[PDB]
């Protein structure tokens, strides 16, 4: 319950979750006739959130995301002080965890950080099913409004107590299996930074979208659960 | 626990059920090499039960499916009085998630909604594997029974409290692991109802077919378990 | 609480769990292109004891499997007079289950119960991977073992409330994983009873051994636990 | 909460962790068109220790892992004392489980268990990706670390009781789905050893590596719980 310290537990979790979901879909989704394809990545990205959650959701309340912080402000549940410091350990333990990758992924052969996209988010060409920017936006803005109707929900005064880390992590799989073919899935501004850096080119120059759009996503969720189903 | 916010959640719900579950089928299930196969799709459909139960379930009931709130009647959960209003937010919901989807899945070239089916259940040719008529109505049957079995069980008053939306949505994946090659698991009226007002052709005229078979299946559950296993 | 709803409970429990499992292995596990695999049929048996634990557990116990139940009675959680009634609900349960299935199947062009083994457990030829007699013993008295050191630690007084029927139905998709390719898995004489009634010829000639290798190892893991681990 | 039951509690639980998990890498992963890949691998792991922790975690506090006893040392929350007779009771449980697994796998024609690596664990050649000896420190380093983190958390005064065991075995999914690729996931000494001693020829000789790193990995991960996070 020190500031200090509840930005160390969410530069951890999204470092976990930025290590845990991209090492899976770097190392793991490709691997020849035994990969674990986008199930396996969608699964990995999901444990990332549960198990931090679980681990310092009790310090922080395991946001791990811009676009979920960001909307914990917007459904009345986190003040505007805290937004900005949270939003930057994210970003950074990000950073972190997807260096450390990268290391790691250039121990073989054959490793190009840049024509392989690192799990990247991206539209268009960059997508990898080649789904168009309005297909981007839709999207992600569905998924970042529904991931915080979860949140709130699953947090609420009268949602039994303990198990919000199994319902926010599982929609974290579940948001994963539906958007992969269409932008890898980014609902996490900070997850996105973290390999776009890696990426060097392309990613960057798409970023900016992966940023303003699960935002405003999240916001709404956070609106709708605010507005609508709280009271009571 | 007013009801304009209580029809609210289960439109939500319904939502999510088929913007989830149908969006990994039309998106995911099938991409080349890497998809998430009828395995990923269970998963999805029943990560969308669980995560808007935690969520939504403490305001509802989290029913997302007529043929659960029609045998909650049955088995004396539901009062008569209800049911007629969450089916229709259920089924509203579910039409605009599979609109949002439509306008997604068009965002890539080929996109056929009509010959590809759009993961609308059918029987006979438009069954997948191709199994007749009495193939269909036996497994719906069974597992809307089954599924209703589930909900009376966990939600039951010596059932211990916080688990039911794990039970539940868990059910809702091994359903859809049973049945797939089947009908592509209907168990839901309103989910059956969202994608077969786009796939226009084929599913439109098999529709009633999943109104009438869930139904009487899950009131049957609900009455097995009223009768034979609640006293007590 | 009464006996005769208490049948009820496990009858269908052991239903759901041989409509399920077994549903998932000849319906939709060779599905060719799209289906679930050995992975896919691990957790739908997993997800009946799980789903059915959750529903039913509290009438009954949830046991579904007659070696479970011997071998509560071992451990010393279930009275020697109440094993034979739960024994034969489970194998009748089983048998309308693996009856509505096989009217399922046959749905289908092609379905030959008979040679394509109807998801029967067997050693040897019968063996999926060819796995010889000592491997099909080795496995399953170990696994019957272990699965019940699960359900004796999952169900213990200072075991915290709640979690029983997480911890044994996951013990169910494990045990799957691990011997499928060796046995196809039986640690239930009441699963391998339903489906060898209809595979009509190899099934039922090497039944005896899913009958007395599952039990024998179920009762020495309530032994294990009973005189090891229990005592405090 | 007798010792000598303490440590049948360990000795069982690493057993069914390299029965489990290992059995299902050197049965099931790679069966022909049907096999469960890696991200079968990473479930049956990840289910050994939530099954087991479940069950005998009341009794242990389940560690079932030398990384994992010597890590929860360094935290603050396992006495130095106890540390050398779970390592052993550990590293011997896992010894029987894998020459059981041993006795399995030779029931089948071809079964070399030098020429597959028997699951075992290594870097450079005999890493299954080829990835250098700088990979596979970084990421068990890296892992083990973040393992401890979540058992801390999890296990943490104020994390709501009930739930580490799901936390922690899913967190031992997530580690296999990340680095299988990479050195056939370690992060647990009695784990490599097991196999190790099975595979005769190169496991043995890298040995050293899998015993040194994921202990440096989880002493580490102990210490930024203790001194970071804890207090409060």
């Given at each position: 319950?020190?500031?200090?310290?509840?930005?160390?537990?969410?530069?951890?979790?999204?470092?976990?979750?930025?290590?845990?979901?991209?090492?899976?879909?770097?190392?793991?989704?490709?691997?020849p006739?035994?990969?674990?394809?986008?199930a396996?990545?969608?699964?990995?990205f999901?444990?990332?959130?549960?198990?931090?959650?679980?681990?310092?959701?009790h310090?922080?309340?395991?946001?791990?995301?811009?676009?979920?912080?960001?909307?914990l402000?917007a459904?009345?549940?986190?003040?505007?002080?805290?937004?900005?410091?949270?939003?930057?350990?994210?970003?950074?333990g990000g950073?972190?965890?997807?260096a450390?990758?990268?290391?790691?992924?250039?121990?073989?052969?054959?490793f190009?950080?840049?024509?392989?996209?690192?799990?990247?988010?991206?539209?268009?060409?960059?997508?990898?099913?080649?789904?168009?920017?309005l297909?981007?936006?839709?999207v992600?803005?569905?998924?970042?409004?529904?991931?915080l109707?979860?949140?709130?929900?699953?947090?609420?005064?009268?949602?039994?107590?303990?198990?919000?880390?199994?319902?926010?992590?599982?929609?974290?799989?579940?948001?994963?299996?539906?958007?992969?073919?269409?932008?890898?899935?980014?609902?996490?501004?900070?997850?996105?930074?973290?390999?776009?850096?890696?990426?060097?080119?392309?990613?960057?120059?798409?970023?900016?979208?992966?940023?303003?759009?699960?935002?405003?996503?999240?916001?709404?969720?956070?609106?709708?659960?605010?507005?609508?189903?709280?009271?009571?």
């Amino acid at each position: 319950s020190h500031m200090f310290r509840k930005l160390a537990a969410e530069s951890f979790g999204t470092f976990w979750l930025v290590f845990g979901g991209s090492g899976s879909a770097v190392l793991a989704a490709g691997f020849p006739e035994l990969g674990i394809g986008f199930a396996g990545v969608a699964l990995a990205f999901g444990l990332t959130v549960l198990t931090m959650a679980f681990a310092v959701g009790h310090i922080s309340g395991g946001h791990f995301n811009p676009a979920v912080t960001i909307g914990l402000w917007a459904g009345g549940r986190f003040p505007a002080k805290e937004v900005v410091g949270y939003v930057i350990a994210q970003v950074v333990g990000g950073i972190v965890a997807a260096a450390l990758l990268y290391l790691i992924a250039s121990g073989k052969t054959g490793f190009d950080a840049a024509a392989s996209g690192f799990a990247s988010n991206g539209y268009g060409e960059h997508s990898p099913g080649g789904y168009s920017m309005l297909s981007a936006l839709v999207v992600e803005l569905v998924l970042s409004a529904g991931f915080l109707l979860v949140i709130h929900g699953a947090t609420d005064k009268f949602a039994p107590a303990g198990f919000a880390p199994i319902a926010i992590g599982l929609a974290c799989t579940l948001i994963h299996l539906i958007s992969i073919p269409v932008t890898n899935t980014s609902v996490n501004p900070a997850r996105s930074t973290a390999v776009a850096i890696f990426q060097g080119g392309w990613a960057l120059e798409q970023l900016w979208f992966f940023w303003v759009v699960p935002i405003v996503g999240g916001i709404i969720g956070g609106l709708i659960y605010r507005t609508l189903l709280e009271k009571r």
